[PDB]
Amino acid sequence: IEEGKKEWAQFAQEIKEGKRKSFVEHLEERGLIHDVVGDRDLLHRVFTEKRVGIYAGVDPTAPSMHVGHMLPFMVLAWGYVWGLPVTFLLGGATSRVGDPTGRLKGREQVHSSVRKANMASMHMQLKKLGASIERYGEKHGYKRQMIWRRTLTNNNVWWNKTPLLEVLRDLGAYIRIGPMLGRDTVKNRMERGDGMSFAEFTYPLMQAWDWWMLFKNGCQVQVGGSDQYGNILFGVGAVKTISKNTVLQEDNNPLSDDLDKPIGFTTPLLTTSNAIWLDKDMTSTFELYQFFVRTPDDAVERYLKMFTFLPIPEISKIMEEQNQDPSRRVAQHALAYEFVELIHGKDEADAVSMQHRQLF
Amino acid sequence: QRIEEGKKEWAQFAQEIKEGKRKSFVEHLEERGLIHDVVGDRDLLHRVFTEKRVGIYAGVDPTAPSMHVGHMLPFMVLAWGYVWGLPVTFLLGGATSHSSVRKANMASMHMQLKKLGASIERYGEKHGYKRQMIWRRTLTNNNVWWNKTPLLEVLRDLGAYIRIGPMLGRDTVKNRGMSFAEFTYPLMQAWDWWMLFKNGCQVQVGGSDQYGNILFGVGAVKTISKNTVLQEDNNPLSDDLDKPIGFTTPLLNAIWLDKDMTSTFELYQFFVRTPDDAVERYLKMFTFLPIPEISKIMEEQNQDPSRRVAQHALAYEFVELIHGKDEADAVSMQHRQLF
Ligand SMILES: N[C@@H](Cc1ccc(O)cc1)C(=O)O
């Protein structure tokens, strides 16, 4: 415990002295940071100086995640093997409301048995992914230390009982609705005329409260998809406010030092040229392999950096061979193999890669 | 047992009302001049009270340690409701209201509302209304549910079905900044009603300025009842006689009901200064005096209004209602002994 703080301090000096990379500099090299919700240099300083907690959220709208969810979790995977405490947040409660961002119409009311089934399946998959990350990290030389920590939490833990009055007192009373109505997501649904419910309008405050609940236990940073910039931005402000105005003395903190203020960033948007599920029963291992081998030549190098733990030198070596003759798909096959191994294990990766070569 | 006998008693009244032999609670209040606007259909309101011994409530926000005379008319309606055998509820908005100040006001107002409840019963006794087992009056602080009510529950049963567009259109809201908490207040008021509606409070009465709030409440309660996931509470309210509905009382420094803020003598004086052209209406609204007795008073008043016979009767009655007979006797004598 104490040794951890000393180790991170040593790393900090080595980072400033150009002998080591910070977590931010590392992610930038992997191409995993799109936008920083706040000041990039501050984010860098925070991770350099502090072994801060970081989390990513996911709402269970399906029994399975797909490849489109992965980049924020690739960030947490890196965080985990870097010895940062990471948290996977399952939005069991917030999924009932539905995130209005990147939508004009409202989500369709799903039956309760379906939502419960989706939530349970996603919970298992996230547990499985957590163990896979450790295994996959091991393959690439990252040996688990006692100080490592990964957590899976359902926000139902608090949303099932959290009184409306508590949220209004500690957060709602300090939030002006004017700016909320100015946000793009709301503005576009009022202008277009798609309408919007009170529940949807409240969603940002729920996400903010989620962060606050984790922030109290050291989770200073949030990472999300590209379209989550707005929610994370709102969250940064909201968390400062709660910490500054909370009536509980055990939790109250002005956060005067910038190094302690909440901050976040987004991961890049994946574009194409249905869904690619991480569940073997929905998308076979063979088909997940196929999806990645079809990665365009002008995208495969970046994907190798974002979707695998392959060292940069090894990626350079792969690309050197790839650039000589990309028809052999050396880069695409390495990408497909690594990601299939991460999600479904080595045996699956070996089987589908052999069968794919024998067939095509 | 008594429940079944109660429905029978109300059934008899209903038949007699249709035959023009008895007044409904609505017709009665109109005779008193206590109804300003009906949030909904007047005839429906008449029908609801004719057919059903419905619950009715009025809300009060503890922004002061005491209520004053400007708050009374909705409570006069509840006073009548009580002695008519309708179950009435006083809702104290403890949750929705420095912190040490707010808690003290809430406690003082709660104490005053209990006292008013007992005073209403006593005052009813004087005018021939004898308490029956079926009578019911309740004082409730909405803190009772707001202390635990999950945000998620409100969003599911209400928040999901309310569009913010219209809310931003409300008169009070459009002409404005505003906090999220303040923006949420209308839904909390609606939820308050829903909590009481589940236990029979189909009707709400409020001040003249409460038309908007009651209007929003009717729609919200319909919505919640129609879409709530607990089937034990779910109900489409297809029959109009079961739909939530309300009405307002007419529009009249402050004349407090707290003796330490406004002396009984000064409360007496205030009503004695009631204008000649208003005193008759006030007698009907602020007292239980039968109309025939009010007629006898006004005709005598009309002989020589300088004697203020009507104003003195009004002042005495209201002081007795709020502070009791001994107080009424004392201040009336002191006023005569002085003037
Ligand atoms: N709102 C995010 C998921 C999320 C949920 C809760 C949080 O606290 C954070 C993120 C999404 O829909 O992608």
Q: What is the CATH number of the domain that holds B15?
A: 3.40.50.620
**Ligand 1 centroid from CA A57, angstroms:** 4
Same domain, A11 and A143: yes
Domain final position from B227, B251, B275: B251
**Angle formed at CA A288 by CA A282 and CA A293, multiple of 5 degrees:** 160
Buried-state track B170-198, b at ≥16 Cβ within 10 A, e below 16: eeeeeeeeebbbbbbbbbbbbbbbbbbbb
The neighbour count for residue A63, using CB atoms within 10 Å, is 18
Provide the number of structural domains found in chain B: 2
Domain final position from B201, B220, B251: B251
H helix or E strand, kind and range, residue A56: strand A54-58
What are the distances in angstroms from CA B172 to CA A198, A349, B61, B62, B219?
18, 64, 18, 20, 18
- Is there an atom of ligand 1 within 6 Å of A210 CB? yes
- Is there an atom of ligand 1 within 6 Å of A57 CB? yes
Please tell me the distance from the alpha carbon of residue B217 to that of residue B16, in angstroms, as a whole number.
Answer: 32
- Asked if B88 contacts B286 with a C-beta cutoff of 8 angstroms, the reply is no
Inter-chain CB proximity B149 and A168 less than 8 Å: no
User: To test ligand 1's pocket by mutation, which of A58, A153, A221 has the most ligand atoms within 8 angstroms of CB?
Assistant: A58
H helix or E strand, kind and range, residue B202: strand B201-206
Same domain, B51 and B64: yes
> How is residue B250 annotated by DSSP?
P
Length of chain A: 360
Residue with the two structure tokens 């003395």: A249
The neighbour count for residue B253, using CB atoms within 10 Å, is 4
Please tell me the distance from the alpha carbon of residue B116 to that of residue B257, in angstroms, as a whole number.
Answer: 9
> How is residue B199 annotated by DSSP?
T
Residue having the nearest C-alpha atom to atom 13 of ligand 1: A58
Same domain, A331 and A233: no
φ, ψ of residue B46 in degrees (nearest 5): -55, -50
Residue having the nearest C-alpha atom to atom 9 of ligand 1: A57
Tokens of A261: 């203020």
**Ligand 1 centroid from CA A91, angstroms:** 6
Same domain, A274 and A260: no
Nearest-CA distance B247 → chain A (Å) = 27
Please tell me the distance from the alpha carbon of residue B161 to that of residue A197, in angstroms, as a whole number.
Answer: 6
Domain final position from A248, A269, A290: A269
| Given resolution (angstroms) | 2.3
Same domain, A33 and A50: yes
Same domain, A171 and A250: yes
φ, ψ of residue A209 in degrees (nearest 5): -65, -40
Same domain, A257 and A315: no
- Strands A86-90, B55-60: pairing is unpaired
Coil, helix or strand for B252? coil
Inter-chain CB proximity B184 and A173 less than 8 Å: no
- Asked if B55 contacts B202 with a C-beta cutoff of 8 angstroms, the reply is yes
**Chain centre distance of CA B81:** 9
Q: In this structure, is the dihedral angle defined by the CA atoms of residues B128, B130, B135 and B141, taken in order, positive or negative?
A: positive
Same domain, A134 and A283: no
- What CATH number has the domain bearing residue B262? 1.10.240.10
Same domain, B173 and B187: yes
Same domain, B266 and B211: no
Q: Please, what is the angle between helix A330-344 and helix A297-307, to 10°?
A: 30
Nearest-CA distance B71 → chain A (Å) = 27
> How is residue B232 annotated by DSSP?
T
Q: Give the domain range for residue A300.
A: 270-360
Please tell me the distance from the alpha carbon of residue A56 to that of residue A72, in angstroms, as a whole number.
Answer: 6
Report the largest interatomic distance among the alpha carbons of chain A, rounded to a whole angstrom.
Answer: 66
Q: Which residues of A touch B (CB under 8 A)?
A: 93, 96-97, 112, 159-165, 167-169, 171-178, 180-181, 190, 195-199, 201-202, 205-206
φ, ψ of residue A288 in degrees (nearest 5): -65, -40
Same domain, B197 and B175: yes
Please tell me the distance from the alpha carbon of residue A252 to that of residue A223, in angstroms, as a whole number.
Answer: 24
Same domain, A209 and A72: yes
The neighbour count for residue A241, using CB atoms within 10 Å, is 17
Please tell me the distance from the alpha carbon of residue A260 to that of residue B242, in angstroms, as a whole number.
Answer: 56
